[PDB]
Amino acid sequence: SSLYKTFFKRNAVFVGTIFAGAFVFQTVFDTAITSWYENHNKGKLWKDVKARIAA
Amino acid sequence: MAFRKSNVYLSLVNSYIIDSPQPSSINYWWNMGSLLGLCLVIQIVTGIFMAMHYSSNIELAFSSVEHIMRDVHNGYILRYLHANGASFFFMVMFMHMAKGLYYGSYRSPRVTLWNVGVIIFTLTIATAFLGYCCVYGQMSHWGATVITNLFSAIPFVGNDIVSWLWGGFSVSNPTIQRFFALHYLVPFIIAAMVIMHLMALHIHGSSNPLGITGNLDRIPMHSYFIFKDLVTVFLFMLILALFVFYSPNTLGHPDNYIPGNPLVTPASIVPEWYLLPFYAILRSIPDKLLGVITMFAAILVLLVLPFTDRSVVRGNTFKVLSKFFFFIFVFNFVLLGQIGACHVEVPYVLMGQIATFIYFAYFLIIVPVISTIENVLFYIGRVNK
Amino acid sequence: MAFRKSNVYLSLVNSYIIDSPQPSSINYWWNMGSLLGLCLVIQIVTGIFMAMHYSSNIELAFSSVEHIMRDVHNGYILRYLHANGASFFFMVMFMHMAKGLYYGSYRSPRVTLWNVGVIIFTLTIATAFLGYCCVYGQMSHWGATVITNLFSAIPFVGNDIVSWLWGGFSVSNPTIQRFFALHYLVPFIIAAMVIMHLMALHIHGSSNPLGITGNLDRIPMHSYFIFKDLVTVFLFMLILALFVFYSPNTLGHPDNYIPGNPLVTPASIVPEWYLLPFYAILRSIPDKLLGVITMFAAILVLLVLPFTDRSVVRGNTFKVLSKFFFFIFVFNFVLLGQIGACHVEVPYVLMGQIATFIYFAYFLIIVPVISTIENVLFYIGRVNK
Amino acid sequence: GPPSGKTYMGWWGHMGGPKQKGITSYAVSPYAQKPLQGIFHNAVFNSFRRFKSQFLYVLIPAGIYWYWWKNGNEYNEFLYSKAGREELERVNV
Amino acid sequence: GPPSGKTYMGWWGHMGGPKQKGITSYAVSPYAQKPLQGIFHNAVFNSFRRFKSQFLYVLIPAGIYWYWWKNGNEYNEFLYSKAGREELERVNV
Amino acid sequence: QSFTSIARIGDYILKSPVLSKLCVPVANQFINLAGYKKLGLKFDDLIAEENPIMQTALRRLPEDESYARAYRIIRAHQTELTHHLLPRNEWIKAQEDVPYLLPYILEAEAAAKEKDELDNIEVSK
Amino acid sequence: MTAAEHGLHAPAYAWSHNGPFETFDHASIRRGYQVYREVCAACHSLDRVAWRTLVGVSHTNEEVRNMAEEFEYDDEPDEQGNPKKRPGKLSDYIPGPYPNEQAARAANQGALPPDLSLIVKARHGGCDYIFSLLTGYPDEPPAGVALPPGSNYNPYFPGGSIAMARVLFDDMVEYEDGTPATTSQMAKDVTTFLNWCAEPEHDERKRLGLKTVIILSSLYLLSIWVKKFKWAGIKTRKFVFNPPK
Ligand code: HEM
Ligand code: HEM
Ligand code: HEM
Ligand code: HEM
Ligand code: HEM
Ligand SMILES: COc1c(O)c(C)c(C/C=C(\C)CC/C=C(\C)CC/C=C(/C)CC/C=C(\C)CC/C=C(\C)CCC=C(C)C)c(O)c1OC
Ligand SMILES: COc1c(O)c(C)c(C/C=C(\C)CC/C=C(\C)CC/C=C(/C)CC/C=C(\C)CC/C=C(\C)CCC=C(C)C)c(O)c1OC
Ligand SMILES: C/C=C(C)/C=C/C=C/C(OC)[C@@H](C)[C@H](OC)[C@@H](C)CCc1oc2c(O)c(OC)cc(OC)c2c(=O)c1C
Ligand SMILES: C/C=C(C)/C=C/C=C/C(OC)[C@@H](C)[C@H](OC)[C@@H](C)CCc1oc2c(O)c(OC)cc(OC)c2c(=O)c1C
């Protein structure tokens, strides 16, 4: 693949870039999963039940 | 020379983990040992962090574990890792042992390696029992009662041992506080025995699936088996994760979510699954003393295999009769466990007594007879006079 | 060869304890290390047996120790052995360190040996503090409070560390339960560091009082130093026995027979005696951050001695100026401790600040200057041109 | 240093094998080899071999024990049903 | 086996000392020697020597520090007595 | 179990034409099911070598057989690790599956047995 | 063992929280609390559940505060040392009907109603069992069964003879959200509520599992590839023998 040779150019990815990418991943991945999860369970959540109560 | 060789601490690491010459042909069955070290680490780390929140008083122990489950951030993860990890520790230990059985790893010159292994197994069984008691559910109390009573079978001074182990008239506060203290200790003795295990491993190196010398073709531990270990480390973690998050109580007993009650033994009492084959063996003998002797002997008889294996080749890979009877042994062992999970009722009592016989007959009778026959078959099939 | 040599486990014992070549001339100052191993064993054995009776809950901890004192058979012996043994552990450690200082044992090629020693010392200090907190007397509570607060001096994230260490708003149940769990753990890490200490010792062997090579005249460890060790082992036990049975509370603080009270700090609060020199050093700096930095630096500066000792001979035996200033250092250290035991009042504050200076000046200034002068004096006293 | 028991494994350069002569080995860098989309087409009818040899050693002991288990269980079920309470009285004590 | 860093101590037979020649040593069995009622008469005016050399290295630093301690203490005592409450006000803050 | 003992039992069977016609076919079929010939091994390559008898025996093996055993063992490990068997034309044939190490083993066992006998001889006057 | 002594196998109902991706239904939890309060709480304690854990799960911060303050708890003694009481706060645990075990046995023919905090995990069958028990009282015992005085028959209980009578009947509760309070609906709700009591971490635990299993799966597949690459030189290695003269 030539997508690799544009960014890292035949060299391996270095720890600093790996560590930095990991911090980014952690946040992005968590939001993607929480979103899917809360959506898949629409109706059942406390979020959804509170919308039908008021006192 | 390279620093990894010259330095006093690093050279240990180098000779055990980096440059250590491995036989080229060892298969994934040789990955279980690293998985056992990993298990030992998971149990120790999660136990120490839980100990920070645990109270060993018999009034507080069960609630202090509910407190870990409910109030401690990620507490349920620690507890479920510990409990399910103990089970996974046994699954992998049985496989590590079964591997040794199949490939003749107990043979000379690795007898010391095998014997130290049998000690670790006894210590690991005792450690898990001590931990199980610390929950102080119903299964905890009666497990502690039944197992401390094993020693009452000892001639004359047996009931004295038991009251000394209890610290009183019955399983009480003294008992649970000392069982926690002991549960904390023994993992570190197991760690020291693992080092002794690896020391005996190092002087002769691993065996291999062919059962012959590995000296003609070694490749270094580093790279090849470091990354090969990684494959099974992740698979192990994946499966442990499926239990911890999706099915955390499937390998335990519902009665241990009931606080221990000294006046009532549940009708539904069943030992932990990894203790069932041994339980069945004891239950098959309708005598108190002989029941506990035979059960202990079922562990010690592992020590006899270097002497009763009469074969002239190491391992079962090229042995048709030995392979067949090995799998008779394995599935007989599973049956013993299925009998342990059953009621003391008609078909089961007899089946358990016959399976018990088959268990001992394997080491003492089948292996010596069959390995002798296979010796002779190998000879007369090639010699023409 | 002899079995003690050929066996995998026994050969370790043989090379460390039996055939290990010792310099013929080492004196009784080289007996302290075995006394430290003995101390480590006494602390671990007595602690485990007490743990069997101890409750770490903040409501129960003090009473559970009174229970060990009153109700546990020989319980007062276990507790007094543990408490007085901790003190004896420090007495002997200071002597072991002072020996190293005097005889240039920190020098090349034993720098690694010395550095691992400094780590053990830090770990031993932390271990004794954790144990002291477990009593939960008045000195326990405020010791835990003051020492966890050391970390609040850390820029920006310091109060966060402290609340994390506490497990809440102040020193409470979470705190004492985790400090017991940690007190149980760290002795085993110290044991692993002692093994690393003995590994570095083994590759170069002991030094000797002359400061020169031992290679021309060795005698085996076994017999000679095994039985020589025995002499000081018994003398050590005799004296420890005199305290444990005849004067068990002379080395402690009466305030720790009062249950901890979060609302009241006694006017009579004084650190444990073996922490007093370091306490004095901190108290001498009228700034929070710099107080805790300087105190930690008083331990780390031990690491600097292989570089600031400029001499060309190992040890002080034949060095008139170095011997004199060594004893200035020792008695300066005792003064620091006597200042620590005193009130923050006029003459004492200044004396402590000057003694603090002398402490650091020894490593950073006196030793490099004096050892250079002695180098030159040795030369011009014999060379005739 | 401290001496040493003779073993059946040495180290690189003195492994303790027999003297080797006449054997020549060849290999090629992983870097120069086909990225792992090879196996299949060449290697999946290949493997699934080593269990044609083996499956009988596993299956026949498994079969024996599963049959024996199923039988004893179905018998216990009969014994504790109405139909079998007469046989139960017979085989029990 | 696994290699080894060169050190400054070997083992029996190769300790790493220089080659020794010309030195001859003699000794006699402990069994053949006088039971331990000897020392004294021959050896007690002997020892108590090694601390004639040393006692000044210990005593003079000890003296300096004991004097310095006694002085500061007696001064603190004065400061907190009636007679010294005037000096106390002066030296305090 | 010693090779002297395996030889005793085996030769008794091999001579008596009752047993010889009964067993050898069983033994022949056992050897084929064993499968070691498909890896390029001879049975004698399979004997556990970590004991003094087998080290004496291997020491006494002529050079050319020694180099050949070394190749067969290395080739077996390489094939094992690839989870293949050799091409069938490379398998060891029954004519080749000779007990080449057996005579050296039996010789060493006899020498050893005699030493044990002579170290323990009693005397009668 | 006889079927009566074993008890009837509880069947598998389609609980909305069954399945790896499924949270609790929090409306069912809310309702189940009401059924607990109005029916079960008269005999059953719930000792391990603190008021605060309800907030954000089934009720609002305000609702829980009102509920807790309806109960009195022991407070610290006054300036003079005489005991005194206190309205409940969110830090308090849901109080039980009886002061001690002996008082609980007295009110139930000598039987002890278990605490329900863990009851879903402390029984084989879990939700299926609890539900089936509550909806499985026959109007009359099967013919021939002689029930002890004070006992009730229920086929799902081991031995058939249980000391709790049927307590759920149609419309004995007025659901605050309009739902028809049939007995099987009320059973479905308390049981959902009691599963939450026993497993409060349920919804979050499964969310974390989803992340953990995705990362570990990937790491597994990845390591296989990396291993094969690192082994390719060794796996395709070739030997030749030329016997020496
Ligand atoms: C309210 C709808 C309610 C529930 C829910 C409930 C459940 C329940 C369970 C799950 C058990 C345990 C059964 C077992 O051991 O498997 C149990 C036991 C008893 N209960 Fe109950 N219970 C509910 C309501 C009531 C009410 C209002 C009363 C008191 C009149 C009551 C009583 C009891 C008693 C008594 C038992 C003990 C059963 C035995 O030991 O035989 N319950 N309950
Ligand atoms: C080889 C190591 C260990 C094994 C096999 C092991 C096994 C177990 C088992 C089977 C239990 C009961 C699990 C359950 O809850 O059902 C347990 C509980 C416990 N263990 Fe361990 N344990 C080990 C090490 C440790 C260590 C070093 C500690 C440190 C203190 C520890 C602390 C605890 C605590 C606090 C409990 C109670 C909490 C709980 O129930 O999970 N364990 N252990
Ligand atoms: C906590 C437990 C243990 C640990 C950490 C451990 C670890 C190891 C390791 C790292 C290896 C090398 C790799 C491998 O072969 O898997 C090994 C080999 C071996 N172990 Fe263990 N082990 C444990 C328990 C046991 C037990 C219980 C037995 C047997 C009763 C045993 C028997 C052996 C044998 C015989 C070998 C050599 C196998 C061969 O090379 O053929 N071990 N072990
Ligand atoms: C290097 C090892 C150790 C040192 C220096 C040490 C030191 C101490 C100290 C200073 C105390 C307070 C003594 C007092 O009562 O005034 C203490 C208490 C305690 N230690 Fe340790 N300890 C060590 C190892 C252990 C170990 C391994 C355990 C095992 C659990 C342990 C358990 C306890 C217990 C139960 C207490 C409270 C009882 C008491 O106050 O004496 N200790 N320790
Ligand atoms: C639990 C603590 C320790 C143990 C068990 C221990 C044990 C030993 C032993 C057995 C020896 C040999 C005999 C002797 O010279 O006394 C030794 C030597 C030595 N240790 Fe330690 N040690 C401990 C702590 C320390 C500390 C705290 C330091 C320094 C900060 C240290 C520095 C040294 C040095 C430099 C030597 C070599 C002395 C020489 O040969 O001249 N040790 N130790
Ligand atoms: C020749 O054969 C070999 C072979 O030799 C090796 C090494 C391997 C590879 C496997 C391994 C190296 C396994 C090694 C692991 C161990 C020996 C582990 C020993 C056990 C332990 C429990 C370690 C000690 C741990 C602790 C004390 C825990 C630390 C605790 C902490 C940090 C608490 C932190 C918390 C707070 C609050 C401060 C092989 O695979 C192999 O065959 C293929
Ligand atoms: C070259 O220099 C040397 C030299 O090398 C040596 C070795 C010595 C001699 C000194 C020693 C050998 C010291 C050795 C001791 C150690 C390294 C000890 C390590 C520490 C430990 C704490 C041991 C581990 C102990 C335990 C886990 C405790 C066991 C617990 C038990 C039995 C609990 C029992 C209770 C119940 C209820 C079951 C010298 O004197 C010397 O110079 C002169
Ligand atoms: C301080 C430490 C002490 C005193 C004890 C340590 C040593 C003991 C052991 O081995 C080391 C011991 C665990 C034994 O090993 C033979 C196991 C196979 C135990 C097998 C076992 O389990 C049971 C169990 O778990 C139960 O739970 C509910 C209940 C049980 O009855 C119904 C048993 C039981 O009847 C047996 C035999
Ligand atoms: C989980 C583990 C944790 C958080 C902590 C471990 C690490 C900390 C240390 O070193 C390792 C630490 C003990 C320190 O080391 C520099 C010692 C010299 C402490 C010296 C010390 O003692 C006191 C003491 O004992 C007291 O008792 C009543 C009271 C005290 O105030 C009045 C003190 C005090 O003011 C100081 C500086």
mmCIF file of N, CA and C in Angstrom, chain C residues 188-242:
data_model
loop_
_atom_site.group_PDB
_atom_site.id
_atom_site.type_symbol
_atom_site.label_atom_id
_atom_site.label_comp_id
_atom_site.label_asym_id
_atom_site.label_seq_id
_atom_site.Cartn_x
_atom_site.Cartn_y
_atom_site.Cartn_z
ATOM 1 N N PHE C 188 7.349 -8.241 51.358
ATOM 2 C CA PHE C 188 7.708 -9.184 50.298
ATOM 3 C C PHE C 188 8.474 -8.552 49.131
ATOM 4 N N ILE C 189 8.183 -7.294 48.819
ATOM 5 C CA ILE C 189 9.002 -6.542 47.867
ATOM 6 C C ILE C 189 10.405 -6.268 48.430
ATOM 7 N N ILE C 190 10.490 -6.031 49.734
ATOM 8 C CA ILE C 190 11.779 -5.864 50.383
ATOM 9 C C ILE C 190 12.584 -7.169 50.291
ATOM 10 N N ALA C 191 11.907 -8.299 50.474
ATOM 11 C CA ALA C 191 12.539 -9.613 50.331
ATOM 12 C C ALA C 191 13.123 -9.834 48.930
ATOM 13 N N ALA C 192 12.405 -9.391 47.904
ATOM 14 C CA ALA C 192 12.894 -9.514 46.530
ATOM 15 C C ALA C 192 14.072 -8.582 46.253
ATOM 16 N N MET C 193 14.072 -7.429 46.906
ATOM 17 C CA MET C 193 15.166 -6.483 46.789
ATOM 18 C C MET C 193 16.404 -6.960 47.553
ATOM 19 N N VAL C 194 16.199 -7.676 48.653
ATOM 20 C CA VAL C 194 17.308 -8.285 49.370
ATOM 21 C C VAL C 194 18.023 -9.346 48.531
ATOM 22 N N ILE C 195 17.261 -10.102 47.749
ATOM 23 C CA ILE C 195 17.822 -11.091 46.835
ATOM 24 C C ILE C 195 18.658 -10.393 45.756
ATOM 25 N N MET C 196 18.140 -9.296 45.209
ATOM 26 C CA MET C 196 18.893 -8.482 44.259
ATOM 27 C C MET C 196 20.152 -7.866 44.887
ATOM 28 N N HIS C 197 20.051 -7.508 46.163
ATOM 29 C CA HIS C 197 21.182 -7.041 46.950
ATOM 30 C C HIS C 197 22.244 -8.142 47.087
ATOM 31 N N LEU C 198 21.822 -9.366 47.386
ATOM 32 C CA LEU C 198 22.776 -10.465 47.541
ATOM 33 C C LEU C 198 23.363 -10.922 46.200
ATOM 34 N N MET C 199 22.624 -10.715 45.118
ATOM 35 C CA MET C 199 23.120 -11.044 43.790
ATOM 36 C C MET C 199 24.294 -10.140 43.427
ATOM 37 N N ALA C 200 24.183 -8.851 43.742
ATOM 38 C CA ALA C 200 25.243 -7.893 43.421
ATOM 39 C C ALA C 200 26.436 -8.078 44.350
ATOM 40 N N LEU C 201 26.162 -8.531 45.569
ATOM 41 C CA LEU C 201 27.190 -8.863 46.538
ATOM 42 C C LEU C 201 28.036 -10.044 46.063
ATOM 43 N N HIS C 202 27.374 -11.028 45.461
ATOM 44 C CA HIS C 202 27.999 -12.298 45.093
ATOM 45 C C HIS C 202 29.022 -12.157 43.963
ATOM 46 N N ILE C 203 28.764 -11.282 42.992
ATOM 47 C CA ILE C 203 29.694 -11.170 41.873
ATOM 48 C C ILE C 203 31.029 -10.504 42.212
ATOM 49 N N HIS C 204 31.064 -9.693 43.260
ATOM 50 C CA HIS C 204 32.322 -9.076 43.672
ATOM 51 C C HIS C 204 32.805 -9.484 45.062
ATOM 52 N N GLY C 205 31.943 -10.169 45.803
ATOM 53 C CA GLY C 205 32.274 -10.533 47.166
ATOM 54 C C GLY C 205 32.347 -9.342 48.102
ATOM 55 N N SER C 206 32.446 -9.643 49.385
ATOM 56 C CA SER C 206 32.602 -8.640 50.416
ATOM 57 C C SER C 206 33.933 -7.925 50.275
ATOM 58 N N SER C 207 33.958 -6.689 50.760
ATOM 59 C CA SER C 207 35.189 -5.956 50.997
ATOM 60 C C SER C 207 35.755 -6.390 52.355
ATOM 61 N N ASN C 208 36.792 -5.708 52.827
ATOM 62 C CA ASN C 208 37.384 -6.028 54.122
ATOM 63 C C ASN C 208 37.956 -4.754 54.781
ATOM 64 N N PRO C 209 38.333 -4.835 56.068
ATOM 65 C CA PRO C 209 38.724 -3.621 56.798
ATOM 66 C C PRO C 209 39.995 -2.907 56.304
ATOM 67 N N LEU C 210 40.830 -3.599 55.545
ATOM 68 C CA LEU C 210 42.029 -2.985 54.996
ATOM 69 C C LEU C 210 41.736 -2.183 53.724
ATOM 70 N N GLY C 211 40.589 -2.457 53.096
ATOM 71 C CA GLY C 211 40.190 -1.739 51.894
ATOM 72 C C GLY C 211 40.868 -2.219 50.626
ATOM 73 N N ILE C 212 41.678 -3.264 50.744
ATOM 74 C CA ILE C 212 42.365 -3.816 49.590
ATOM 75 C C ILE C 212 41.805 -5.185 49.202
ATOM 76 N N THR C 213 42.380 -5.777 48.154
ATOM 77 C CA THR C 213 41.913 -7.048 47.621
ATOM 78 C C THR C 213 41.860 -8.170 48.654
ATOM 79 N N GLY C 214 40.838 -9.017 48.513
ATOM 80 C CA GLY C 214 40.679 -10.174 49.374
ATOM 81 C C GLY C 214 41.078 -11.453 48.661
ATOM 82 N N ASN C 215 41.533 -11.318 47.415
ATOM 83 C CA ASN C 215 41.730 -12.452 46.522
ATOM 84 C C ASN C 215 42.889 -13.379 46.889
ATOM 85 N N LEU C 216 43.788 -12.927 47.753
ATOM 86 C CA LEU C 216 45.013 -13.670 48.033
ATOM 87 C C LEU C 216 44.865 -14.615 49.221
ATOM 88 N N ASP C 217 43.777 -14.451 49.971
ATOM 89 C CA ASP C 217 43.542 -15.257 51.167
ATOM 90 C C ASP C 217 42.048 -15.338 51.518
ATOM 91 N N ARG C 218 41.333 -16.277 50.902
ATOM 92 C CA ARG C 218 39.941 -16.518 51.273
ATOM 93 C C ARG C 218 39.803 -17.748 52.163
ATOM 94 N N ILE C 219 38.808 -17.717 53.038
ATOM 95 C CA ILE C 219 38.334 -18.900 53.747
ATOM 96 C C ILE C 219 36.817 -19.051 53.524
ATOM 97 N N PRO C 220 36.325 -20.302 53.456
ATOM 98 C CA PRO C 220 34.909 -20.585 53.172
ATOM 99 C C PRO C 220 33.959 -19.977 54.201
ATOM 100 N N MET C 221 32.774 -19.599 53.732
ATOM 101 C CA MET C 221 31.718 -19.157 54.627
ATOM 102 C C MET C 221 31.449 -20.240 55.655
ATOM 103 N N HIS C 222 31.290 -21.479 55.198
ATOM 104 C CA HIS C 222 30.894 -22.518 56.118
ATOM 105 C C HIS C 222 31.984 -22.926 57.076
ATOM 106 N N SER C 223 31.453 -23.160 58.273
ATOM 107 C CA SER C 223 32.145 -23.164 59.534
ATOM 108 C C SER C 223 32.435 -21.756 60.012
ATOM 109 N N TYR C 224 33.441 -21.118 59.425
ATOM 110 C CA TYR C 224 34.041 -19.944 60.053
ATOM 111 C C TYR C 224 33.065 -18.816 60.330
ATOM 112 N N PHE C 225 32.350 -18.393 59.295
ATOM 113 C CA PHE C 225 31.443 -17.271 59.424
ATOM 114 C C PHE C 225 30.011 -17.676 59.752
ATOM 115 N N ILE C 226 29.683 -18.943 59.527
ATOM 116 C CA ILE C 226 28.409 -19.465 60.005
ATOM 117 C C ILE C 226 28.380 -19.401 61.536
ATOM 118 N N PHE C 227 29.449 -19.876 62.167
ATOM 119 C CA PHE C 227 29.511 -19.880 63.623
ATOM 120 C C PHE C 227 29.871 -18.526 64.226
ATOM 121 N N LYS C 228 30.646 -17.731 63.497
ATOM 122 C CA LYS C 228 30.852 -16.337 63.862
ATOM 123 C C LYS C 228 29.540 -15.525 63.791
ATOM 124 N N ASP C 229 28.691 -15.794 62.796
ATOM 125 C CA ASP C 229 27.370 -15.153 62.724
ATOM 126 C C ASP C 229 26.539 -15.516 63.947
ATOM 127 N N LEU C 230 26.667 -16.770 64.386
ATOM 128 C CA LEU C 230 25.878 -17.289 65.498
ATOM 129 C C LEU C 230 26.123 -16.517 66.784
ATOM 130 N N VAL C 231 27.372 -16.095 66.991
ATOM 131 C CA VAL C 231 27.745 -15.292 68.153
ATOM 132 C C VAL C 231 26.917 -14.010 68.256
ATOM 133 N N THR C 232 26.784 -13.272 67.150
ATOM 134 C CA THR C 232 26.033 -12.016 67.173
ATOM 135 C C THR C 232 24.533 -12.212 67.064
ATOM 136 N N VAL C 233 24.105 -13.322 66.472
ATOM 137 C CA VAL C 233 22.691 -13.695 66.471
ATOM 138 C C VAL C 233 22.146 -13.869 67.889
ATOM 139 N N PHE C 234 22.920 -14.525 68.753
ATOM 140 C CA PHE C 234 22.489 -14.751 70.127
ATOM 141 C C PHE C 234 22.562 -13.477 70.959
ATOM 142 N N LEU C 235 23.629 -12.702 70.777
ATOM 143 C CA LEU C 235 23.745 -11.416 71.455
ATOM 144 C C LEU C 235 22.607 -10.501 71.047
ATOM 145 N N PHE C 236 22.256 -10.527 69.764
ATOM 146 C CA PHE C 236 21.133 -9.739 69.271
ATOM 147 C C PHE C 236 19.834 -10.193 69.946
ATOM 148 N N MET C 237 19.609 -11.501 69.995
ATOM 149 C CA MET C 237 18.398 -12.038 70.611
ATOM 150 C C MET C 237 18.305 -11.750 72.111
ATOM 151 N N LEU C 238 19.426 -11.891 72.821
ATOM 152 C CA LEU C 238 19.509 -11.550 74.243
ATOM 153 C C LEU C 238 19.000 -10.128 74.514
ATOM 154 N N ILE C 239 19.554 -9.162 73.789
ATOM 155 C CA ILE C 239 19.205 -7.765 74.008
ATOM 156 C C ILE C 239 17.760 -7.479 73.598
ATOM 157 N N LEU C 240 17.326 -8.052 72.476
ATOM 158 C CA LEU C 240 15.939 -7.886 72.055
ATOM 159 C C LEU C 240 14.994 -8.474 73.102
ATOM 160 N N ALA C 241 15.420 -9.584 73.707
ATOM 161 C CA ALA C 241 14.664 -10.244 74.770
ATOM 162 C C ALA C 241 14.546 -9.384 76.016
ATOM 163 N N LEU C 242 15.631 -8.709 76.401
ATOM 164 C CA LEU C 242 15.592 -7.788 77.548
ATOM 165 C C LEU C 242 14.557 -6.688 77.363
#
